[PDB]
Amino acid sequence: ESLEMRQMRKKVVLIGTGLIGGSLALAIKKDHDVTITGYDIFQEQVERAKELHVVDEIAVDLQHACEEAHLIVFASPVEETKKLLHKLASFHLREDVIVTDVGSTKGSIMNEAEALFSKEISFIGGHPMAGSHKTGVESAKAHLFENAFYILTPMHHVPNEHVEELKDWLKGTGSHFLVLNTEEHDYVTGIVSHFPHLIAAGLVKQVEKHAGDNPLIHQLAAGGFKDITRIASSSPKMWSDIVKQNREHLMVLLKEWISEMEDLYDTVSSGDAGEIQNYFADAKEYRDSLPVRKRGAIPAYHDLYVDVLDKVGALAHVTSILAREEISITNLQILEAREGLLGVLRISFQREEDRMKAKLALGEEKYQTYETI
Amino acid sequence: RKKVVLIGTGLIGGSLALAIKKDHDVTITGYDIFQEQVERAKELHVVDEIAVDLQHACEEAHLIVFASPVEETKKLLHKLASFHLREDVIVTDVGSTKGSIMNEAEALFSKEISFIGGHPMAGSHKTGVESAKAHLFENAFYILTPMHHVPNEHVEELKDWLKGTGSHFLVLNTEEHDYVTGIVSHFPHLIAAGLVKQVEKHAGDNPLIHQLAAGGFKDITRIASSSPKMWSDIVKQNREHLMVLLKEWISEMEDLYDTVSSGDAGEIQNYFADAKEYRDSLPVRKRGAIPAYHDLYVDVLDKVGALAHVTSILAREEISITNLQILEAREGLLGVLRISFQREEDRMKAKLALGEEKYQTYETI
Numbered sequence A: 001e002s003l004e005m006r007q008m009r010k011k012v013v014l015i016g017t018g019l020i021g022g023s024l025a026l027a028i029k030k031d032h033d034v035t036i037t038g039y040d041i042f043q044e045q046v047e048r049a050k051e052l053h054v055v056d057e058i059a060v061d062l063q064h065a066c067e068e069a070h071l072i073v074f075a076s077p078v079e080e081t082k083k084l085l086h087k088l089a090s091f092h093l094r095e096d097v098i099v100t101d102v103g104s105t106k107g108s109i110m111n112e113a114e115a116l117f118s119k120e121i122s123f124i125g126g127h128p129m130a131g132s133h134k135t136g137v138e139s140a141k142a143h144l145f146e147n148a149f150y151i152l153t154p155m156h157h158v159p160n161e162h163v164e165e166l167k168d169w170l171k172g173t174g175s176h177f178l179v180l181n182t183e184e185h186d187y188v189t190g191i192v193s194h195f196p197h198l199i200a201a202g203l204v205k206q207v208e209k210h211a212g213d214n215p216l217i218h219q220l221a222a223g224g225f226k227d228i229t230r231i232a233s234s235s236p237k238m239w240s241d242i243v244k245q246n247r248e249h250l251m252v253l254l255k256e257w258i259s260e261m262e263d264l265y266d267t268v269s270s271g272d273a274g275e276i277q278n279y280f281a282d283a284k285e286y287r288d289s290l291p292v293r294k295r296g297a298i299p300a301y302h303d304l305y306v307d308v309l310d311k312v313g314a315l316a317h318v319t320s321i322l323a324r325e326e327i328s329i330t331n332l333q334i335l336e337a338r339e340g341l342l343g344v345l346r347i348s349f350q351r352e353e354d355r356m357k358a359k360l361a362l363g364e365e366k367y368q369t370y371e372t373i
Numbered sequence B: 001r002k003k004v005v006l007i008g009t010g011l012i013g014g015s016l017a018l019a020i021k022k023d024h025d026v027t028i029t030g031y032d033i034f035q036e037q038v039e040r041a042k043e044l045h046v047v048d049e050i051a052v053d054l055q056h057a058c059e060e061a062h063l064i065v066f067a068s069p070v071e072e073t074k075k076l077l078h079k080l081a082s083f084h085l086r087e088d089v090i091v092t093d094v095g096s097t098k099g100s101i102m103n104e105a106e107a108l109f110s111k112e113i114s115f116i117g118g119h120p121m122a123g124s125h126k127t128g129v130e131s132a133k134a135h136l137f138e139n140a141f142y143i144l145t146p147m148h149h150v151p152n153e154h155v156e157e158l159k160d161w162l163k164g165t166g167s168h169f170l171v172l173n174t175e176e177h178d179y180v181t182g183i184v185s186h187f188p189h190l191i192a193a194g195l196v197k198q199v200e201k202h203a204g205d206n207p208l209i210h211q212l213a214a215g216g217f218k219d220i221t222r223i224a225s226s227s228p229k230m231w232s233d234i235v236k237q238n239r240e241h242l243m244v245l246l247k248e249w250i251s252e253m254e255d256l257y258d259t260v261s262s263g264d265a266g267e268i269q270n271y272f273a274d275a276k277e278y279r280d281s282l283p284v285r286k287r288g289a290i291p292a293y294h295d296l297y298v299d300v301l302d303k304v305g306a307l308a309h310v311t312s313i314l315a316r317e318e319i320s321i322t323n324l325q326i327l328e329a330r331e332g333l334l335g336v337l338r339i340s341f342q343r344e345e346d347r348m349k350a351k352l353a354l355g356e357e358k359y360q361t362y363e364t365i
């Protein structure tokens, strides 16, 4: 009754069948013929996942499904993930299995996995930099992580071939994979993600302190301030765990920050407009530079600068030209470079051939283009 | 026709001139430091005449509007105080701080002349008069700070002059204005720049910091792209308010350092919840002290022509885009393409047009 090919295809287990996990399942299915068996704490999400062909089967027996699996994917909250990794370490898994997770911090998970498997099993921590942690499987899409950074943190022993193999499993995501060591990941994300969270909340809180003394503050904090502070509305539970899990990195950062504010306090209070202006100019120069896609980093960036006018259809025209030439654009931005209605449009391409081609096509249409600034 | 003088014919000033003209039949004579901006303003019917003689134009004027940098404004106010102006004149400025300008005006005029400091809380991606528009300040707060003696009738008169802006006018005292804007606008600009600077410090030690720069970090620091010149003046002019704020902030960070280092997840959670609760309570889709981004996030697939399709749709609806980006670091942000608009009406319109073409879109809550 069942087809020999269906019986015999590879098998995946997904633990946590929500937005993130469901999306990963769709990206897997897109490029691999597999039986995905799914598991959730909430039985409605797995059943819906099944209905939506996000998973193939609902897991009766967790152990049976795991022991026959070529790939096991955790998309659960990090407490639950620890508890289930323990269970997994009790099981008799296949020799060739790959196990992976999703989480914003890596230190504690990886510390647990070295402690339970050592060198038996190929556990590779993961962090896809896209989407949301609580939202449903109805929203899951194969392209959710497309062109997003997806960090992989392999155990110390895992061969490079297994890391490449996992990249192949997730090929369908279209993510830019970076392989980092665990400390590297928590350090970087600490500076670049977690610490801003703290500062965002702080800003909001500072403003609320004063809002009782004039109600106008609540009115004037609409629009820009509210937009700036967006991340402060994220889950307090999730973020308190992140902060607890990356505590030491953040303590150090806060100490440097206090120090920076003390120097800023000296600059502001000295009242030297030249020094103040310098402080702002340094920040502007750097902030204007982002993305600063470096030469030997992943992925490569080949930029072209175009003189375009601030009018309806300017971008439509430029992008239609490029599309007609069958050139794919990796990024674009408007940089406001001087006065007047002109702006500079920066277009990024995947490789040098494509930039060259775009330069010619735009030139034949009487666009002025540049290589720098 | 009544006669208006505009001193500073750029985005802000030019826009004010257009809003005046919209509801009043007047001769607007313009003046600038840069002769090109005033000549362009004339070409564009933003001003009617280019001022030959500054004093002549000021002495016949019913309304005088300064839209210049606050240093130049002090210098020109001094000149004005030397002139023989009309009995009924109204004089007003545009400036992000009020303390120093008002202080100077009480010192030069005292109770003779009706000076009313002004602050329109709106801005733009551009700087020149070519970008000026009558509706620039529509539904924006526009603060008025009248001298101590100015009768309420003259404040109402000025509101009538500027009816065309569509702004919501608030009459504040000068200290109140600098205190509030200090908390709500200036101080965040300082913190934004500080964050950028903190991050750059570390970027030499790992280049991944440049690459992996998160969405949240980018968002809170977007304002760090504003004019360093303008902001350094603002900071110098509101120095004492900011020194106090920075001191409180240092203290807050020290308490946060205790909370984080104590490791109590309940207390940490409370800190975040307090911030969320408050932030969630702030008005939805209104204008405040920091110009908004008016961003729209769009779900698109990476294939040739994806951007072309989206921008064509928007252009056909005659919506002008201020910016756009493909986000590679977008945790918590559904939708890969971020489009920025000039104002809320345009974002709304773009959302409908894209929706009708079966694009999924998102907006931040």
Ligand SMILES: N[C@@H](Cc1ccc(O)cc1)C(=O)O
Residues within 6 Å of the ligand: A308, A309, A310, A311, A312, A313, A314, A315, A316, A334, A336, A341, A342, A343, A344, B319, B320, B321, B322, B323
């Ligand atoms: N407004 C243009 C894009 C643009 C924006 C700002 C500029 O400075 C230049 C061009 C469009 O809709 O296509």
Ligand SMILES: N[C@@H](Cc1ccc(O)cc1)C(=O)O
Residues within 6 Å of the ligand: A146, A147, A327, A328, A329, A330, A331, B300, B301, B302, B303, B304, B305, B306, B307, B308, B326, B336
């Ligand atoms: N490559 C698309 C734009 C795009 C880029 C990255 C994406 O993830 C999605 C869409 C174009 O050339 O129009």
